[PDB]
Design a protein around this ligand. Sequence first.
Ligand code: MG
Length: 223
Amino acid sequence: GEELFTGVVPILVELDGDVNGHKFSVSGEGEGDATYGKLTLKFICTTGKLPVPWPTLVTTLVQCFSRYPDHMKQHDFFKSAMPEGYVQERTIFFKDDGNYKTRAEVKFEGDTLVNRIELKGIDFKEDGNILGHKLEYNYNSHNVYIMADKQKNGIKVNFKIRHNIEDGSVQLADHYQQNTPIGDGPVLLPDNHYLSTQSALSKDPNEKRDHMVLLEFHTAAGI
Ligand SMILES: [Mg+2]
């Protein structure tokens, strides 16, 4: 699977969402260079205005582009499942507010890495930080904790995202994640480790549609 990632790979992302009954779609395009753990993508809301803040969708919108150091490469589940791919499922609990449930299939279509997602959000507060659009347009750096889930030939992942609030406070988003292979071939089941992440959000000055431009780095560590 790793041999598929030694150069620059085109990426496509397609999401359909429903948050408290607000339906929307997002399309993204860009490229990944796993040698450097690097992603660059632009996302557009194709149905109009996004009903939630862009930062809340970053984690949902391709961990196969992480840089695994050579001494840890036997622990890279994500690339080992390729090209047939993996199912990535999450529950994201926004503290004092609602939750997202997501199901994604990540796989190659030809030479392009595709991430196709369905997202469902329930129990959000109309005047909370999500539906109230009180989150700053920025993004923090995190540690993503990974363990083997041998009963499903996959992995279990957990981490805390910190979203800055416009009043100086922080909105926590606790992430619970599971990944299972789509194919029935062998995968790399890892020892406990983590991914170190950093991300920068920006806007395309000429773009009038609701959108997000993102630069992200993901690097494995801990063994
Ligand atoms: Mg071991």
